[PDB]
Swiss-Prot record, chain A:
GO cellular component terms, A-Z: extracellular space
Protein family membership: Belongs to the calycin superfamily. Lipocalin family.
GO molecular function term, any single one: odorant binding
One BP term from GO: sensory perception of smell
Record's subcellular location: Secreted
SUPFAM superfamilies, alphabetized: Lipocalins
Name under which the protein is recorded: Odorant-binding protein
Organism, as annotated: Bos taurus (Bovine)
Keywords assigned by UniProt, alphabetized: Olfaction, Secreted, Sensory transduction, Transport
Phylogenetic lineage: Eukaryota, Metazoa, Chordata, Craniata, Vertebrata
UniProt-listed Pfam families: Lipocalin
Protein task: This protein binds a wide variety of chemical odorants.
Major localisation: secreted
Subunit relationships: Homodimer.
């Protein structure tokens, strides 16, 4: 019985959007800039940054977007995306993230958003059980597809 | 006496699941446009009827399809289901977060293919859901202005 050491960087990896709420419905409606499907998040304790990787559909087509947020002294984060954003992490753990974002667009319009995201965790022993079974059945490693990375890098 | 009955309570594990890895003795079956290149979405276990409903997506002929398959348990402990032929699969390892399975498929030409798979569950805890709803209520956001991204038709394509 063992568990990996807790590190903020250990939180990095595949994450998925569960719910997103908005004070302005238009921002999260179809073709809205904040109807974001998360792919991955990367936390960097040293630089005080969080890199966001998500997909959003615009003009009827899906786009992959990357946004880097920078932490401030007050613990909040700032990021440039469809205007200026100030993001606060309300709750964070190995499996979930609840955040509050304040966005002010190119027209001075303010929108507040809430979100719940969940992390997809793949444990070491589960991976080992999969590979053992795979080799027991005589399946070549090149005959294995990684669906998770496909979902994390869509098109 | 052979083995004894197994106290089975998997109803608990129902919910959103995702495909991590799928291996195959026949690469054609899981290559692009392959029938088993299946992206899981949801799994529902019924302990009383002894079944498992699979909800997944697969790309066929350049087109995405949402598929629903019902599997039925057997005295054997394995499950059988019809999908691109006859299937007999076994759950090798299972927990609140992962599923490792072995499936044997025989297509319409009698060809036998063995597949292995690792799937992970997307667990949404009540404590976290409550935190989200409280925060959402605090920001004066109406429940109708909240979008569910777990169960939504309009989503990105993995390929
Ligand atoms: N700072 C941000 C940058 C890009 C997308 C975001 C999407 C969000 C969704 C819910 C709550 C906060 C969010 C912050 C975001
Ligand atoms: N019963 C099933 C129906 C449809 C696709 C499946 C894909 C699988 C992949 C690896 C192991 C078992 C599988 C069972 C499947």
């Amino acid at each position: 019985e063992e568990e990996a050491e807790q590190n903020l960087s250990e939180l990095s990896g595949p994450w998925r959007t569960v719910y997103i709420g908005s004070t302005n419905p238009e921002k999260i409606q179809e073709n809205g800039p904040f109807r974001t499907y998360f792919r991955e998040l990367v936390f960097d304790d040293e630089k005080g940054t969080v890199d966001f990787y998500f997909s959003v559909k615009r003009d009827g087509k899906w786009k992959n977007v990357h946004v880097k947020a920078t932490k401030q002294d007050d613990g909040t984060y700032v990021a440039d995306y469809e205007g200026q954003n100030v993001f606060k992490i309300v709750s964070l753990s190995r499996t979930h993230l609840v955040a509050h974002n304040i966005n002010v667009d190119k027209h001075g319009q303010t929108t507040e958003l809430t979100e719940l995201f969940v992390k997809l965790n793949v444990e070491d022993e589960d991976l080992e059980k999969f590979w053992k079974l795979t080799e027991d059945k005589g399946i070549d490693k090149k005959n294995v597809v990684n669906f998770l990375e496909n979902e994390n890098h869509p098109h």
